[PDB]
Design a protein around this ligand. Structure first.
Ligand SMILES: [Ca+2]
Ligand SMILES: [Ca+2]
Ligand SMILES: [Ca+2]
Lengths: 318, 318, 318
């Protein structure tokens, strides 16, 4: 009948060496929050949550702001949250680079501030979904559905959704006097994923398919994407990970394109509240845009070459 | 001789349906604060207060930032606070719409960040006042005085003040190239209010009068405003409320104008830390601008028509 | 082997009367933070720190964001911190005006958000240093080294560094259409300081020398600066302080210039968590720009005259 109040956070600190650039030091995506939960009876519980950022860069601001109601019929969560998409994710186990090949948030950056989200667990067969209120085109249209289920040692999921931005930035031409090109884009995407636990080892594979149509315009981009990845706990506190990520983008204009991302890294944990990371990442070719869930990094649509990247992490959790 | 340190807050979450618009979900005006109080002796106590916002929208920022000193001669509070005006308020018992007819903050939005405020309670006959430092026209001129007193079951107040903005936005014409019209406006206002408690019931009536002159210009707007309102606790945790609010604006140019706001709603409280709200609001005609104290909503000067509005609230307090 | 978690802060409130201006009230530089420390063994400790602002003015934001590692070989601190320079400071004991004559941060405002800092204490002979990562000219080049040592009752330090901004604001001409003049400036500075404790009394003297060269341009400004200052605890809770600060700026163009700052004030402390300040400050002539460490005030490059300033402070610490 009573409740729990958890005050939690991370203090990320990163040292990064990215292709063609200088060393950076500073915060990663440090944040701090408060999960408050209260069980009323057996068919009713309540949640109040609010995470905010402690990045070293801009003004500080709220990241998630949530009212949750759990029932017999499932949990409904309301307000500013990450997309159901991002919660489900897919097979990327990096803390820096990588996450390309998951194509759910080309337009969303994994976020919609004005959304309703549903969850339902069972004899671990589960269902998650969400809807984004466009709050009169101040926000994106969003709608997603995923479903999964574990078979003892195998773990599966599939689903997708549809996200649209009426005024999304597609380019720039300045002429002196600097302006960007807006355009109304729809991203309609689907995935399937499997994960296999072999004691220390873990393997994962995801396939993403995705369609970017533009209204008042013939253009269409079919993306088709394969992530394969895994982790292996070696010593007592030590985990290694890696992944290959291959993406192909056909345009309806004929124009074909691809992109490759490879990573290899190590999570050591002095404790659970004290972790350090080291990761290499090789990239070549094109992304249309992606989010690394581990760093919270956004990479906007780009083409890379010859592309080496190292990242050294040190976090304090609470 | 010792002190109290209260860490407090609200986690508002609102679902709103306003005339001619789409559904919104998200935070209302969530905030969080710290009241710190310390009694030194019988003729001396100290306060330190700082509230900040957790809205789901912009950067997060400080709302109130206060140093208070209580004495025999009364409490002096210093720094960023709401106007004495707003503290006193008048008869509006809504959580969303309504608050028109209180005319104290057409220009202030109920706030001055650089003000000194005085309070004095007695054999409950009380006096409140405040002054806003213009800090060289970076801020509004403000000066207010209110006085009240309870007669057992009747509760009265009257007062007003004068607030001026040297560069207040009166309109816009863009021509291609988008610009707004500034103008130096004075709002000089007075009210009287009475409130009557009949066990479960509560009735309230306020009258506001107000004068907007403009310097270097003939224009003047006399507002004259009548709020009447009340609440009635029905069941164990249930309160109902309503109000009629009628405002008339004569201009000195001849031009007459009016505005009507009606509300009806219900506060249910699962507990004191858990409340839910439902409110209807009908509006027709003109406001020159107003603040709803219950939602923290600002409505800028506007004319409405045919105007239906619903609002469903859910807050967690601490 | 365990750790300490300190939640700390200040609630500054200031009332200021500066030459040619109106009274201001409001916050000074209120902030709040969390120092977290953990000793692992005798040759290893860890720190996590994050201070953020509660100013009454803009958005709220992070001030310092730190990962510290202490060893036998010394403490390395990483991320957003004040400059080593500012930590060391020099002889200014004011809470408002004064701090001119310390010339370390003409360009930095005492801050670099992307810096590595080293510290080493001994049989109190100490060494501090730091490097600022230019993170590809998004940030200033910085590099500093200071060293000190106490002789029982005398306390000495000397050092300096070099700080450069590729695009620093040197002026403005608007022509209608408002633009500022950027220019690539280097500030290369050195100091020596001594401090003498005579029970209640304290005396201090600093000398600063500094050179501002500009790339692609003949201009150079030699500053040469003498602060002399002190404090004297009179009654039980009462401290008085004062300082004379004289600065001379030769330009390489011939053009000579100077500036004088004098202060006198009193720190009374009702307790350690409750302090009040009163300070007078006389200024005449030129600063090229400076920071008062006590108020956190930035004064941009300016020439003053006839210049009287009072400041009344009231802080609550925790
Ligand atoms: Ca915790
Ligand atoms: Ca509380
Ligand atoms: Ca403390």
């Amino acid at each position: 009948d009573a409740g729990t109040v958890d005050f939690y956070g991370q203090l990320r600190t990163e040292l990064k060496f990215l292709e063609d650039k200088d060393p950076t030091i500073g915060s990663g995506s440090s944040r701090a929050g408060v999960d408050a939960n209260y069980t009323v009876n057996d068919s009713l519980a309540l949640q109040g949550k609010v995470e905010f950022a402690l990045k070293d860069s801009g003004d500080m601001y709220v990241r998630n702001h949530i009212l949750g109601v759990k029932t017999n019929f499932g949990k409904f969560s309301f307000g500013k949250q990450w997309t159901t998409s991002d919660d489900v994710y897919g097979a990327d186990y990096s803390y820096f680079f990588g996450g390309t090949g998951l194509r759910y948030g080309t337009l969303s950056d994994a976020l919609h501030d004005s959304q309703v989200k549903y969850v339902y667990e069972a004899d671990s067969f589960w269902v998650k979904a969400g809807y984004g209120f466009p709050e009169d085109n101040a926000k994106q249209e969003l709608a997603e559905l995923y479903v999964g289920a574990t078979f003892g040692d195998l773990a599966v999921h599939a689903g997708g959704g549809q996200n649209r931005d009426k005024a999304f930035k597609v380019g720039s031409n300045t002429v002196g006097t600097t302006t960007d090109i807006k355009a109304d884009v729809t991203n309609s995407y689907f995935e399937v994923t499997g994960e296999y636990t072999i004691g220390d080892a873990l393997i994962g594979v995801t396939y993403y398919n995705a369609e970017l149509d533009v209204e008042n315009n013939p253009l269409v981009i079919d993306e088709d994407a394969i992530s394969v990845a895994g982790t292996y706990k070696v010593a007592d506190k030590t985990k290694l990970y890696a992944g290959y990520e291959y993406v192909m983008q056909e345009a309806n204009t004929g124009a074909d394109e691809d992109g490759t991302l490879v990573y290899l890294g190590v999570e050591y944990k002095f404790a659970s509240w004290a972790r350090v990371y080291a990761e290499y990442g090789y990239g070549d070719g094109t992304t249309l845009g992606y989010t690394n869930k581990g760093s919270d990094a956004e990479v906007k649509a780009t083409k890379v070459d010859s592309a080496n990247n190292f990242g050294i992490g040190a976090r304090y959790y609470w």
